[PDB]
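INPUT
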Amino acid sequence: ANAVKTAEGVRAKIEELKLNLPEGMEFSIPYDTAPFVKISIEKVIHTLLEAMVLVFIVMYLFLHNVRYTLIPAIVAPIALLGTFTVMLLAGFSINVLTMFGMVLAIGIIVDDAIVVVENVERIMATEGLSPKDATSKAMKEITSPIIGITLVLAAVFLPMAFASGSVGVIYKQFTLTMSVSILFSALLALILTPALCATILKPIGFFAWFDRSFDKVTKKYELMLLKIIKHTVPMMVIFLVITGITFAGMKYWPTAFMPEEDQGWFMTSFQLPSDATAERTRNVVNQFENNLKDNPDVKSNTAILGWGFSGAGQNVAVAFTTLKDFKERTSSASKMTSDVNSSMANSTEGETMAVLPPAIDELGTFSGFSLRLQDRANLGMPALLAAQDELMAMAAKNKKFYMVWNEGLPQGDNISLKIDREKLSALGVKFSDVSDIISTSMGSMYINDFPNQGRMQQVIVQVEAKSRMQLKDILNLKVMGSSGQLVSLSEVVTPQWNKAPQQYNRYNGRPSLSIAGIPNFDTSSGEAMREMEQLIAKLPKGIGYEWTGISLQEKQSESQMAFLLGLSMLVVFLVLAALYESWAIPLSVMLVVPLGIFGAIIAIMSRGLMNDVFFKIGLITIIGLSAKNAILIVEFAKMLKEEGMSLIEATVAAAKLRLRPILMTSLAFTCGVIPLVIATGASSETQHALGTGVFGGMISATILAIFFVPVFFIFILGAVEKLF
Amino acid sequence: GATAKTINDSVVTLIERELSGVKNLLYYSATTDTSGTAEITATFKPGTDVEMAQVDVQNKIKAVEARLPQVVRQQGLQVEASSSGFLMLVGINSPNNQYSEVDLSDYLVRNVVEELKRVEGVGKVQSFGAEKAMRIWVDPNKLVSYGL
Amino acid sequence: VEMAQVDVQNKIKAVEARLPQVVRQQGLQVEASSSGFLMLVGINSPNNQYSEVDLSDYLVRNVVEELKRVEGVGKVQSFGAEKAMRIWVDPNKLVSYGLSISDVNNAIRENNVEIAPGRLGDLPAEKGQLITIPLSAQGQLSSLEQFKNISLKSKTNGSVIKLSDVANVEIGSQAYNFAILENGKPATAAAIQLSPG
Ligand SMILES: CC[n+]1c(-c2ccccc2)c2cc(N)ccc2c2ccc(N)cc21
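OUTPUT
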């Protein structure tokens, strides 16, 4: 069911039911999560609009003409509309993931049209040709590179859609929303762009300075490249060093699954001792409400007394605290929860846990790591609880965790009455009478229904409260004997006090205990899980552990990274080999992946961001984009090589001619992701995670490739010629 | 009519034996408290049809209805689709204390809960109040005097 | 198969009432025929130290679930007899004391019973109540001696007699229809069905 529409219907129904409401009764909606969905959607749409505007400005800064800038820009809305049609046909829905995919693709989907228009303008300016002849020549020159780039960038995202688990579902949204949009952009670039260039382009201050500076920079780049090509082995050694650093950073950097986001509300759970009553829990709940009173950042507070998410009873309570709007708020939800926990720890008779909402709606009820400690050797419940206590002792003294606790009802006292059947027989008492008087002593019996104001209502018979509060009242119960005198239960039943669990839990058909924990700041989810595993390894034999909820999905996501990256790289390599009919040309183009992963890792380290799913998606995107920037030079260099020019001359000429398209394309993508990088407000964490890695990787690939891919080409082709 | 241990040893384990073996199952768990109820949850792999899962579970759990205790058998074993969290909380309050908690809770149950549950897309409505009823509080020391 | 099984069960539910009481109490077992048979696992006693019931009990308690959690193992079908508390009543001894089968059944249903546990301090609670504690009682019989010590009342003389006097109590099989022999000795078996895929 759709959350937004269901909430709208509920709010409408409540509106109709308001009219027929007795005076003195008021409806309220203290807790509601539906609005945040639309807020996030509108935020992502605004980010998309900002990215579009920035990309248009970047294109204008280079082309210098409004018509030239419009010709590529028109392709993005049409490609996005086609992508929307494909999503509707395939069953996909509009959500933050698909919209983020569109935001990422907005820079890519203008690359082909940018390449077409740049070549058309260059031909018109240099050769003094008419728009229609210039377009014809440009397309004849650039048909193949566009197809190659499109195929590579469509194939690169395919493998991650075949992943298992929730991470596979996450990757699927980006895969579709990027591949379909890229295909549609390539089709538009090959169909509509030539017609517009031939038809709506007329024959040919800051712009003059930009042009002169760009010619100067092109000359400097040519001279620097000519100097550089002389030194090739040193530049292979440096590339190996960079690859090693990239591998070390990728392997030894903390990993996570999903950034934690502020949704404007947090949760609180109160667990009190087994012997606690409703009044005792109400006392601590009143202290929590008083502490949260007068705080400007709280809109409404609701407490459910007697119910919980990990067991219900008289000693449990749950409260939902809603915060004010982000603009009106002054403190983050995490700080609110930390302050609540600090306040409650000092003065309370039970355990109060303030937590933030989970990363995913149905994947748990809290943000953190969840563990299931299992008794796998039939050790026994008390042994499992002793192991739990020792694990808590180890975990409470560690700096890798903030707070680790148990999400279950505490162990408690039990009273058992042993019946002396021999005494019952001797006194003449009948066992069934004892059985009946004990069973009904302190229980509610539903009997029949009776009409109350037109509704059937229950008749419940129970013993009065004053006679079921202490064991003495039960032991005072009397039964009739054969001789005639009444005999109290105390004469015939012996009470026994024991310490036993009040809740029984099982995971995968074994005795189990649920544990929750919050990693400390500067510690990621993966680090906390590894440390918890190490601590568990020290527990007595016969005790095992399982990862459930978010933890299992995170482990599965981390397990599949290497295979996915390798398969994507192999697919791109095979596509390039098919397109260019060589095993060495793809090899040169495959050496830029380290150049981008260097820079992606650097950006995430500089900003202190973890390796998460969005980082992996950015890595795949950077693989595709670096393959594009290598192809843009390598294709033309090879073609000039068959024309008759030498390897070095052809490569240098190709780099000199293709500098401008590469810089334009790379800068368009880079500026298209700044809004994600510098996003502020609500949902900013996800935008930062999705944007920082791609930003760094694109910068590194653009700056480093222009000097490395020519050397890769020359070195590989020379080695191939030498060996064979 | 049983403790947590008895329910665990009679209902939870006996059913969970057969639960193990359904199609596309990630894991299964069970919980029992002193409230007289037991809750088993089966989690299936992502991208799985919930409707097929419910019928498969129902088929696999009806093979043990005979061994199940009589009270559970007559009350029935309830199978449902899972919704982890709350979409929203709808509350009624008395600004001037005109109506007490019991009255508000009776009105909510008898005029609001059913209306809300019929809204399209609503899966489950959990009311945290109780309807009114006729309570008979019996004094144990009195009826024994009259021999009842 | 699932959609046939659910339809069949739903249609059976209509006539569940009109069926004989004992059939209802035993229950109607509905299953779907499976063809993914993989192997058989059995246990035998060369020295006859154990019987078929004991072997089946051991297999179900400590073997079946172990095999079920092996990768690729789906359903496990144990063939054998489940243990039960069997009372064999001698009619001559019963008539000696003027007792009948119905009296023995009533005594068993009376002495062996479940007592509903409760909570002291449960809501609604008296003001000032601080401690709430569960309280339980045991009425069921879990040992052979306890069943043998059940007390009946003789009508002829009014004296108190024990169930062991009029009957022999033991631990046997719920049903004795089938027997399994491994090379002419007691044995039990379980068929392992391969999981799909
Ligand atoms: C429970 C009887 N029963 C049936 C059986 C008989 C009638 C209907 C369904 C199954 C059975 C059916 C097949 N194919 C193979 C072995 C056995 C078996 C084996 C041992 C046993 N002690 C009872 C057994």
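end of record. The CA atoms of residues 162 and 629 of chain A lie 27 Å apart.
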